[PDB]
Each structure stands twice: as structure tokens, then as C-alpha cells.
DNA sequence: CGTTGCGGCAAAGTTATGGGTAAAGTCACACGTAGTCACCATAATGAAATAAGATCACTACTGGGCAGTACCAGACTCGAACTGATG
């Protein structure tokens, strides 16, 4: 249902978060990372939280901007 | 002890949504929208006609009475005559 709540822009943002975190999930972190460490750590923590209590961790990277306003 | 990664906290950053205000657009005023067959049931006469009714004319059948005739007496009336009392 969270996936059904996502937008193509939210999908692209989740894709960007996944591409940012993916080097940190393989033991080969990049030496040139513009995104600060706190956001990377939060994304990784939510990845693990989703893969623990949901079943798949990508679903923990969904923004769902539509509720805001 | 120092370093490194991780996580909480609270501004800060980004979208979104319902308000206000000047300013670029937008569009009608230019004589004009109402207007016209098609439609089939009901009243409604006026004519067409009725189906029975009304009367004429003829044919046949069957009740049935009127002007006139006729007899057998009974009964009242009266010519004609008889006969007795009388002044």
C-alpha cells in the first residue's frame, strides 16, 4: 500500500536514495560523496528497519509528498 | 585515550494548500431566436339508412235476421129485433 501511495517523482527520489546507499551496503563506500553522513545513516537505518519489520527494505525509502500541505 | 561509525534532537529545507492583490487576458456590443410540420384520439354533425311499422287492395269463409204470411180463437161493441110497463 505504501508503494501504491508513491508518485513517479517520489519513486525517482527513492531510486536516488537507493543509489546513494548501495555502495554503503557492499563494503565498498565511495571516496567522493556529496550527500552528508547523517542522511546516509538515516537512509541505511530505515532500510534495515524496513527489511526487519516489513519484509523488503526499499519500501522504507518512500517519501509520499502528497500528505504534506 | 584517541578514533570511527551510529543514532537522538531540533532547527532548516522542501512540497503542498487555501487566501489576497494588481494585471494581463477574454470576449460581446455590434437588428434579431423562437418557429413549424407531424401526429392520432374524441366530439359532432349531417347524411345514409334502417327495420320495423302502417295502410291499401284483394280473396276466401262463415254467422245469421227482416219484411211478410198465417191461424185460432177470446172478447168487447152494437144493428136489428123482442117484449114488458105505462100514462
Q: Are A14 and A58 in contact (CB under 8 A)?
A: yes
Q: Is the CB of A53 under 7 A from strand B?
A: no
Asked whether strand B has any atom less than 7 Å from the CB of A4, the reply is no
CA A6 to chain centre: 13
Chain centroid to CA A36: how far? Answer: 14
Can you give the distance from the CA of residue A22 to the C1' of nucleotide B18 in angstroms? 40
CA–CA separation, A30 and A5 (whole Å): 32
Among the listed residues A56, A64, A49, the one whose alpha carbon sits nearest the alpha carbon of residue A14: A64
Asked if strand B comes closer than 7 Å to A68 Cβ, the answer is yes
Tally Cβ neighbours within 10 Å of residue A55: 8
What is the SS3 assignment for A50?
Answer: helix
- Cα separations (Å) of A60 from A28, A31, A34? 22, 26, 22
Name the resolution in angstroms: 3.7
Amino acid at each position: 500500500q505504501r508503494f501504491h501511495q508513491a508518485s513517479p517523482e517520489d519513486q525517482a527520489e527513492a531510486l536516488e536514495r537507493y543509489k546513494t546507499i548501495e555502495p554503503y551496503l557492499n563494503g565498498h563506500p565511495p571516496e567522493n560523496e556529496t550527500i552528508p553522513a547523517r542522511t546516509i545513516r538515516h537512509w541505511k537505518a530505515k532500510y534495515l528497519i524496513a527489511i526487519q519489520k516489513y519484509g523488503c527494505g526499499y519500501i522504507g525509502l518512500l517519501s509520499h509528498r502528497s500528505v504534506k500541505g
